[PDB]
Design a protein around this ligand. Sequence first.
Ligand SMILES: [Mg+2]
Lengths: 110, 356, 115, 68, 65
Amino acid sequence: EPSTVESTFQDVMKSGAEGAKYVLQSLTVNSKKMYKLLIETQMQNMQRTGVELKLFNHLCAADFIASNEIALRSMLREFIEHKMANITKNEIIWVPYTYAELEKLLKTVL
Amino acid sequence: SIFLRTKALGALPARTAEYEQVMNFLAKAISEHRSDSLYITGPPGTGKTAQLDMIIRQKFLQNLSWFELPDGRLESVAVTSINCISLGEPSSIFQKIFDSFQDLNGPTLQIKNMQHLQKFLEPYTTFVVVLDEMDRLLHAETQSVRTILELFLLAKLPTVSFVLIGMANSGLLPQTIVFQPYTAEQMYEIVIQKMSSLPTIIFQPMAIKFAAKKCALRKLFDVLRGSIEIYELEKGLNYIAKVFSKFRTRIAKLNIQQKLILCTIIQSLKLNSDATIDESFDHYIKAITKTDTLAPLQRNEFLEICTILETCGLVSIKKTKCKGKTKRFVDKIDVDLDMREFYDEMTKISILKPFL
Amino acid sequence: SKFSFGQATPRTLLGIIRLSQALAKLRLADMVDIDDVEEALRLVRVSKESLYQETNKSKEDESPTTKIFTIIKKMLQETGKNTLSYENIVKTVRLRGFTMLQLSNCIQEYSYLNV
Amino acid sequence: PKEEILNFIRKDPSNTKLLELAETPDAFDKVALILFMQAIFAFENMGLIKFQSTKSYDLVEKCVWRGI
Amino acid sequence: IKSTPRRSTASSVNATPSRFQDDEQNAGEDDNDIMSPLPADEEAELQRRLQLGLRVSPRHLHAPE
Ligand SMILES: [Mg+2]
């Protein structure tokens, strides 16, 4: 017997592909532009280690999105709560996610 | 006065895309007498509670009214409002619904769970409930999702008539509707729609456009209200810019003596990573002795300078443990400022160089 | 540190003497001057600085307020009082070469922060 | 087999959702993953396999040997 | 046309918005006064207007100041 009744009591499907799309939908317009530049820079060479701390500030110099330099902590503490940009300073960040399903996320946010 | 009524301020403005989707859920549950559960999510400030309260206060046994069907009929619809955070226990949410529907003249029965609440809605009448903030109903995975799972099963089985409309905060699944936040053009229409009852409008068309884009609804109300209190305390386009600026600066507000200790705090965290208050005091003393400038301070008065940085918002002092052989509880020191603004304010005085 | 070389052995001290004595033979001089000692010590510093890069920065030409602050440190070393009446520090600034107008602006600046 | 799996899932014309999934080129890679996840969890409830960490789910161990 | 017009015309940006300047209005108002005597690409001008943040004082598509 395949056991269909007892199989609905455990987490069979078990960092959130469909859950990350609902987070960006509830955010503002300027909040989605901050995550779009981080994905394009990280998925450029999957052998790039990621986006450095001062590297993210260089993207704001070419596109007026944030305010200044002290406003970086206001957006960094919110992305780490939804599990989307893990830190790994040897500050180089890298989220544990492959580029197989990450390419489809750029079409939804566009 | 026109300044007193402006600061105090069924289709809501900038919400016609979600108002029709909400009324469509009730067109199939009251007309066909089918039980279903609704789920509403979104960030705080999208006007979720203001949208549901406007429908009840317009187109809607105590608490009995009449609802107008699209084709043209009449039915006894009972609508109530019960908040989840305004309760004592999450398991006692079934008793509050009974007190809001049953009349006070009849007998008051006690409800324990689902078996005592389903039998009451069997003979009956569309019971509409508005459970605000359903995210607090969990017990802070098996025992946590118990009140939500029980209330969802009560509004899914037939033979009864109980609808559930919840407003959370960001084959029997509820219809999820994501509330989109207000943008620049959406926040501007609500301002003119809310202040439409006023005879004279003292606001400028170019000032509301700046506050609508900089705040992208509760944050916009505090900006417009602050401009009226500021203008009335000193006696336009510049009125909207003063509300965003009055609410590098934390460094200039300190003295020259407090800047020397602060410069040694970030210096000890670079060559030692995790450091405590006892280790930071020894590094500051040995750093000022080679220069032979300014008199040193004792360890008792060393905490007075660090208290100024904590109140302003530059040094965060927490309580953690150690990582060596003597892993005991000790007070660790940490910072939360940027290195770009730190290496630019102290360099303008041209009096300190080895301390940076 | 990472560039941990050898210890200051006494054999390295005799090497500077042999290098300074060999430099005097090329100049046909029976006495070692000061230029022979500086030339012999330069060859040792060059061989030791081969690991470091060619990036050297030095700047020490700020406002003259720092030079006046050094005179105040001499009074605190002998006594150690932060009083407002300063009649002995003015006599030391005049002997240096600074004017009396710029001295009054430096004392008022330090008195505001209580130094 | 790939030809027998696609031909069996298309024998139910009443279900319109079963014919839409078989039209995708990744249909054989998705059906085999569903049956594999149902058999893996069925083996853990009986005590055949064993998981390592809780927030990992990447390696499985053996705890039942036939013959002993 | 880049080592001199990029610096001379940058001083007029601090006094052009009466100080909020939108990027949509730059292609409708400055195209007949600044972009007409000095031709430049629309994509290349976006990086020049965004590089003003390095000077602290001249700070979405809007340019607050
Ligand atoms: Mg609310």
